Design a protein around this ligand. Structure first.
Ligand SMILES: [K+]
Ligand SMILES: [K+]
Ligand SMILES: [K+]
Ligand SMILES: [Mg+2]
Ligand SMILES: [Mg+2]
Ligand SMILES: [Mg+2]
Ligand SMILES: [Mg+2]
Ligand SMILES: [Mg+2]
Ligand SMILES: [Mg+2]
Ligand SMILES: [Mg+2]
Ligand SMILES: [Mg+2]
Ligand SMILES: [Mg+2]
Ligand SMILES: [Mg+2]
Ligand SMILES: [Mg+2]
Ligand SMILES: [Mg+2]
Ligand SMILES: [Mg+2]
Ligand SMILES: [Mg+2]
Ligand SMILES: [Mg+2]
Ligand SMILES: [Mg+2]
Ligand SMILES: [Mg+2]
Ligand SMILES: [Mg+2]
Ligand SMILES: [Mg+2]
Ligand SMILES: [Mg+2]
Ligand SMILES: [Mg+2]
Ligand SMILES: [Mg+2]
Ligand SMILES: [Mg+2]
Ligand SMILES: [Mg+2]
Ligand SMILES: [Mg+2]
Ligand SMILES: [Mg+2]
Ligand SMILES: [Mg+2]
Ligand SMILES: [Mg+2]
Ligand code: NA
Ligand code: NA
Ligand SMILES: [Zn+2]
Lengths: 66, 104, 238, 33, 137, 51
RNA sequence: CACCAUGUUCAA
RNA sequence: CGCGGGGUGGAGCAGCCUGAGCUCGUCGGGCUCAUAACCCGAAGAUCGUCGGUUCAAAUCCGGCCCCCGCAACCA
RNA sequence: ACGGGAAUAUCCUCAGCACGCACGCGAAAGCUUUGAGGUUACAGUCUCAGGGGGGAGUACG
RNA sequence: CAGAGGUGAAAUUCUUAGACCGCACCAAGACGAACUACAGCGAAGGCAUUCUUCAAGGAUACCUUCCUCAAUCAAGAACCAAAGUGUGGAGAUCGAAGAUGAUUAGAAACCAUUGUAGUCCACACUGCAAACGAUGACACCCAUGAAUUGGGGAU
């Protein structure tokens, strides 16, 4: 259903009005999983910070860097 | 009104040649002389870093020992498109004489 | 777009179940003989599958065709024309060779002369090919000039020597030996070695070879080219 | 813009208006004689 | 069944995927090494309902996933890649769906062979559409 | 003649006549695929032979 | 890169 | 004069085959420094006139006031 | 073998398209052996055009 | 096999009578990418694939020839991009006019799909360009650094 990811870096606020934060997320899976230590760039709505956790659901789309 | 540039915005000295055959702008297709158009040779990666990593993992051919192919393109823009795309920007009058002879 | 088609017809079975698999066989001068597989409709009525298989052109990378060759082979593709169907084996003949687009485009540099030569030659067995050689000028080791453009008379001299060598070397050999020379770069090394004294060259290479005229089909000559033909198990029971 | 004040319509179109006017006048004289 | 060739289990069977990525649509088209026989062809317009989303990376990713499913059905487990833009006298820049489609094929389990750009490039050309003033927008 | 007569000199019917018209009726533009001033290129005339 | 048209006459 | 068609909100036009709509216009409030554009609302008929039939007439049938056409030929 | 060859390196030279660079000049922008310099300390030779803005490159011939 | 095309978004448009896409070809008319440069050639306009040819042209080199034959120019002469004209060809692409679809208060504009004349060639006209270095031709003097094209001299 949804895969948990850990925010390891806040790349910066993106978009007009600065309400969207672009972050680097490491997928949290056990050792040997295909998503183990897989890092993707995501766009986050709401106040977030480093070491926060996200429920990604889909983990294929990667946010365009800004 | 006033002569803005000594070279008149092109690489055609007064006694070098009469006409330079124009080219189509890379973006809009506007015809501009080849010596005037803003020329850029771009070597772009076919994939960004993340996608290239995934494709290289699935590729028996591409990996640490064999690099992925790149795109090679000579792009010539009309002046308007070069400015609008920010390939080139208006500069202070004293900085307009600064020229680069190699890609930095 | 989904759900947008208005006019579908203008008036008002599984596809893969009808397909049989075939192996494509390169000539014996290539280490990997059974490169590539393909499909074709089963022979139905008067439409015999062999009649629609002959003439098909298959493209493969030279490094895949010749294992343990090197990264230089990996930037060339070789095409083959199916000349005869033997069971489920598609025996082929050389069609064309080309350098990949990325490799060829990367060879271009600004402050140098790009010299191109087109050569047409007939082999001993009546095959006619076009050769499309390209060479680049280079600065010398101690050169301080801002460009290494070549004098035009040297460019024409380079073109004539390339044309004479290629015609001399390829006109008295068969197509099989000619392909071996081209794919193993024997002609290429000969060309650059003898053309450098005319003009300092960064690199000379044959970017495209194309067969423009083939002789009348000969079954025996095709079999002599293919030597020992690896068996095809496509028609066998699983 | 690459030119100074025209103090009128674009000179190319003013020239065309004059050109059409000259054509009309020479046609009127032709029908008269 | 599986409609595959008579090969040992796990052996690579190579097709050729032609990815035509324009700024209006993406084509993910799988053929054999000759190009005469086509296994599957899925476009971005078959995955979305809005015209403006036909060239989107998500549409290309969805098209590629269906391509992978049918390729597994047909018995093709590896793909050589031929990438192209519009080319001709038009733009030489690949469309947005180019990268997403190739990545989706790799992440779906499909093996990737040789990759090459086959954008048609004229060595001299006819006149491009638009006037000498270009498109004025 | 089919085009004869009238209080004005005119053909009162279309001048393109069928291929199957009997002699005496087949006058004018016989079995014309098109009429009017040709623009943008003269096509090859005569019967169509795909061979 | 949807669509932004106009501002009465002198004189501060 | 004979034959035919037409009078509907301020304008043009539907419905014209018994139980009023369209666009523009006008009025009120927004947006603008203001006007226009734009947005939200509102009002405006008695179906040319006079009779008849019908439980009911824009509607159906009669006469009238006008408007617009087609014809007014053989000597 | 287009071969007593070919290209570089240092220096010189004549001819050509030019660049950043001293006088001097210019209302200034700028020009500068490539003058717009060598001009009120005004004269090497020839030639074309201009005389406030419009009407107008119009009318007539 | 179900869409394709096109756009800011769409529609005109194409499409199960198989469009778009894929491979190898065939036809025809244009064009000569990257290399392509404050580079070359030409009186200007202009000129870019290769090979084979025909007349030229500048520069350089010379202890060759010659002997003022020169400079600039009313009149006069030849050439002159594009568009335009005439007669034959040709007609792929693009595309004045026109058509359709959008946008808009209106839009017979910009945008989209098209499309005539043209765009190309031969011959003959036209001689209207920001035909610009907005800078007439010939000749003399003139300071500095780094380059560049062609020919010579020295190592
Ligand atoms: K420029
Ligand atoms: K020069
Ligand atoms: K100019
Ligand atoms: Mg200005
Ligand atoms: Mg300019
Ligand atoms: Mg010159
Ligand atoms: Mg010019
Ligand atoms: Mg790998
Ligand atoms: Mg050089
Ligand atoms: Mg301005
Ligand atoms: Mg002025
Ligand atoms: Mg689209
Ligand atoms: Mg579409
Ligand atoms: Mg604009
Ligand atoms: Mg009759
Ligand atoms: Mg008649
Ligand atoms: Mg008449
Ligand atoms: Mg008549
Ligand atoms: Mg005012
Ligand atoms: Mg100077
Ligand atoms: Mg004086
Ligand atoms: Mg005056
Ligand atoms: Mg070329
Ligand atoms: Mg003179
Ligand atoms: Mg012309
Ligand atoms: Mg004629
Ligand atoms: Mg068109
Ligand atoms: Mg003039
Ligand atoms: Mg000059
Ligand atoms: Mg002038
Ligand atoms: Mg030179
Ligand atoms: Na009539
Ligand atoms: Na078909
Ligand atoms: Zn442009």
């Amino acid at each position: 259903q949804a895969q948990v990811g850990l925010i390891i870096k806040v790349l910066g606020r993106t978009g007009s009005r600065g309400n969207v934060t672009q972050v680097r997320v490491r997928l949290m899976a056990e050792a040997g999983s295909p998503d183990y230590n897989r890092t993707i760039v995501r766009n986050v709505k709401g106040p977030c910070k480093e070491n926060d956790m996200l429920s990604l659901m889909e983990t294929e789309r990667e946010a365009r860097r800004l | 009104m006033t002569t803005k540039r000594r070279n008149h915005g092109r690489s055609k000295p007064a006694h070098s040649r009469g006409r330079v055959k124009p080219i189509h702008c890379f973006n809009c297709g506007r015809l501009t002389p080849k010596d005037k158009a803003v020329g850029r040779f771009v070597v772009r990666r076919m994939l960004d870093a993340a996608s290239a990593r995934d494709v290289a993992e699935a590729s028996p051919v591409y990996g640490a020992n064999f690099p992925m192919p790149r795109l090679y393109m000579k792009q010539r823009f009309c002046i308007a498109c070069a400015i609008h795309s920010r390939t080139v920007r208006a500069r202070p009058v004293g900085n307009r004489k600064i020229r680069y002879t190699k890609k930095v | 777009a989904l759900g947008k088609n208005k006019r579908i017809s203008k008036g008002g079975q599984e596809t893969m179940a009808r397909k049989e698999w075939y192996d494509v066989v390169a000539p014996a001068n290539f280490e990997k003989r059974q490169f590539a597989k393909t499909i074709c409709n089963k022979t139905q009525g008067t439409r015999i599958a062999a009649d629609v298989l002959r003439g098909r052109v298959f493209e493969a990378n030279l490094a895949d065709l010749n294992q343990s060759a090197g990264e230089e082979e990996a930037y060339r593709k070789v095409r083959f024309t199916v000349q005869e169907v033997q069971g489920r084996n598609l025996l082929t003949q050389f069609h064309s060779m080309e350098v990949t687009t990325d490799k060829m485009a990367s060879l271009l540099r600004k402050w140098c002369t790009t010299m191109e030569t087109t050569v047409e030659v007939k082999t001993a067995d009546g095959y006619t090919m076009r050769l499309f050689v390209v060479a680049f000028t280079k600065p010398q080791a101690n050169q301080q000039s801002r460009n290494c453009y070549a004098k035009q008379r040297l460019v024409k001299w380079l073109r004539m020597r390339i044309t004479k060598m290629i015609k001399r070397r390829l006109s008295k050999v068969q197509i099989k030996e000619a392909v071996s020379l081209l794919t193993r770069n024997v002609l290429s090394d000969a060309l650059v070695r003898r053309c450098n004294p005319i003009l300092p060259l960064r690199e000379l290479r044959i970017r495209k070879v194309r067969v423009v005229r083939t002789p009348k089909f000969d079954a025996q000559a095709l079999l002599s080219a293919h030597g020992t033909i690896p068996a095809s198990v496509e028609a066998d029971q699983r | 813009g690459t030119v100074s004040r025209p103090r009128g319509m674009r000179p190319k179109w003013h020239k065309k208006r004059i050109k059409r006017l000259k054509l009309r006048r020479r046609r009127m004289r032709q029908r008269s004689k | 069944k599986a409609y595959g060739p008579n090969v040992k289990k796990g052996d690579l069977v190579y097709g050729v995927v032609h990815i035509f990525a324009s700024f209006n649509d993406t084509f993910v088209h799988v053929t054999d090494m000759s190009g005469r026989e086509t296994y599957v062809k899925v476009t971005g317009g078959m995955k979305v309902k809005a015209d403006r989303d036909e060239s989107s990376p998500y549409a290309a990713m969805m098209a590629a996933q269906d391509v992978v499913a049918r390729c597994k059905e047909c018995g093709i487990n590896a793909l050589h890649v031929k990438m192209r833009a519009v080319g001709g006298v038009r733009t030489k820049s690949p469309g947005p769906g180019a990268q997403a489609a190739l990545r989706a094929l790799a992440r779906a389990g499909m093996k990737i062979g040789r990759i090459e750009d086959v954008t048609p490039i004229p060595t001299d050309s006819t006149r491009r559409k638009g006037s000498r003033r270009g498109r004025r927008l | 003649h089919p085009h004869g007569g009238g209080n004005h000199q005119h053909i009162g019917h279309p001048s393109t006549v069928s291929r199957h018209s009997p002699p005496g009726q087949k006058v004018g533009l016989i079995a014309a695929r098109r009429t009017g001033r040709i623009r943008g290129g003269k096509a090859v005339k005569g019967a169509w032979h795909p061979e």
